Amino acid sequence: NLLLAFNLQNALKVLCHPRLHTPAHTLNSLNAAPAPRDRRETYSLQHRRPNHMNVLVIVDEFYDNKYAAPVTDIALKCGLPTEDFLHPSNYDLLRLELHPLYDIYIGRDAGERARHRAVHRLMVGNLPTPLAPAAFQEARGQQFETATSLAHVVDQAVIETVQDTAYDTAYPAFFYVVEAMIHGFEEKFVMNVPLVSLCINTYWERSGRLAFVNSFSMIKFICRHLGNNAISKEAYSMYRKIYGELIALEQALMRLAGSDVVGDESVGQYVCALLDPNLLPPVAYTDIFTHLLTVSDRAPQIIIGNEVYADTLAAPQFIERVGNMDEMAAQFVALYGYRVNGDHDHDFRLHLGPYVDEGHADVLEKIFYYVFLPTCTNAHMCGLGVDFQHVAQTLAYNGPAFSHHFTRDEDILDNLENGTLRDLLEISDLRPTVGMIRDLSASFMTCPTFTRAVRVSVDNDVTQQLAPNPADKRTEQTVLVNGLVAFAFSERTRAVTQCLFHAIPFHMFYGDPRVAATMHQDVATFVMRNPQQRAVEAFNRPEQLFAEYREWHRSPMGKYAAECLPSLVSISGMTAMHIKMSPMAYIAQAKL
Amino acid sequence: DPARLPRDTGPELMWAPSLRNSLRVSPEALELAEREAERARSERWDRCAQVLKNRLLRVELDGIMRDHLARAEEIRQDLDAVVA
Amino acid sequence: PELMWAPSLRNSLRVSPEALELAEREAERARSERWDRCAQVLKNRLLRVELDGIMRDHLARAEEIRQD
């Protein structure tokens, strides 16, 4: 009659064996079955590689007059509670769900034996909502917050005002063109500082809430620069608090990682996936691409339109940096010639900047794009794409900025003609003077031309590289280079910016049809004919662009993000579900 | 001269209708695969057209890349006749 | 209901005398296109690996520069 305790850590004498993790016996059982599952999926198994490079043709081909709208089995799982999942109606789903780390699919019978191929669930947020509902996730996050003794320094008010930032349909698209012109460069922001000092000031005056929260590098420049009393104190306070939550949460995760090392490198990249550098942030302005080829002991493959880029010894062949703008003064006209007389389809070159060797482990951008903005705002944004030549003709063929003898400190609304900038600035209703629009014109010397999407293909870490299918050991991911991400649009915005922006629903948190159907009138009919596709969990996305099974974030992450109430408990749950399911992750979880 | 019939199941003699002697055809998926592969074929129709202009311009650029070292060689080989 | 043709060895295909002659010509025009693309990208890789030979030979010739 003693009270023998039974924690988690006593169970790690059997929860860390590899025979929990090798599905070879499971696939040898499922392939040697006398009867396979009859209903097949064939929607987003393999990321087929696009031969072209521009992302507008992929989107406009994937959604013209499309009638058959499938849905994956992973979105079929997380669309129903626990009880009916265990009901015998859904034996066609329970024939597959048979391992907590592997969601085995059947694929196609293209060859002879349709083999049960098994992709791996990396993080614990990939568990289906029937077997782990949202309440369990947020209560687990509440255990996590007192596990690391976190000090959540954001109130409710910042979360709800950044929530109705994205839920505002009247977001000024002038902020989109300002972000598309700046696109995360320090020396570029030192140009347009008194511009955004006027923009977010008149937006804070306009509707109470704040703007420009749709980019990490932008709010990072807001916290770093621009505290010089140009904005009101309450507007700067929201940005500084949002910057503070990320570094507090990352100190919390680094507390969860503890003080242990494997080999010589630390263990933070094995237990949590945010501290894993091989996860990539979904917006890449700066160079990060050479960095994860240099720091990863595992072997990643940066796939840009069936170009492998497996080694950094042929690194400048695939990607060139633009560096600072003052280096390129001998190459301005050469870059313009590569703009105009360069066939950008069948062009596998990437135009980026430098890899800033910042003290934030390419991870502050990662944590803000993956834990905050999809959960304070319920994953209700889509990745748009810009054409920089079109915004340059927008921002420099106008009247007053071209003359250079119309002076600086005057109105721009009176003296410009009725171009796209005119009605773009009407519905925005801000008054940026002439001259501070001139550096927006001036950045075009060193902006790139297109919003290319690169499907990065990183291999898994050492803990779960036990799949028998060697091409299925790795977990693919896409990242929309050189474009920002955008909140809700109006039809008035689409009527003036149909020549400017095109949506790319590329990520799990960032492929949302309720926003992408506004600014892109091909999916607007696709959801009009198939109205069930409007949930973020089940929306069709291009398999040549985004592979739903081969992804770090499956459908239940989006389901939780779209149904969590935006508050502190939801944030702590969302950073609680980014923890991987390694045995080392189990060890660093049972320590805490 | 064929015949028409609804169904049967599980034979041993071969030429008897069954449920395993039915070819398993889904019409909509095959039409979808056929249409998308026609468009891949139609893109493959227009591919080997104008790399000859790229061949002539690459001959031009290797010409202008040889002419620079042709300029450099005799100039580098005249700066050795001042040593006496 | 739905009616299925009975399995017998006197069942006919839908007779095709004319649709095979143009067929292999379209096949040859497609496969020459594919083989030319494969040889083009192959020669692209071949010039890429051949150019590093002359870069190595240039850095081998540069030894005589280093004492001059």
């Binding site: 062949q317 | 070292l69 450099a72 | 240039h58 520069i65 001059d68």
Partner: peptide, 29 residues
Amino acid sequence: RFVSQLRRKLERSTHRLIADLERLKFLYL
């Protein structure tokens, strides 16, 4: 003895310009 410096930095600069033009080829194709 000023003939072993200026012409030498000249040929070094041209030996870098030819690698720059090979990189310009790799920019082209």
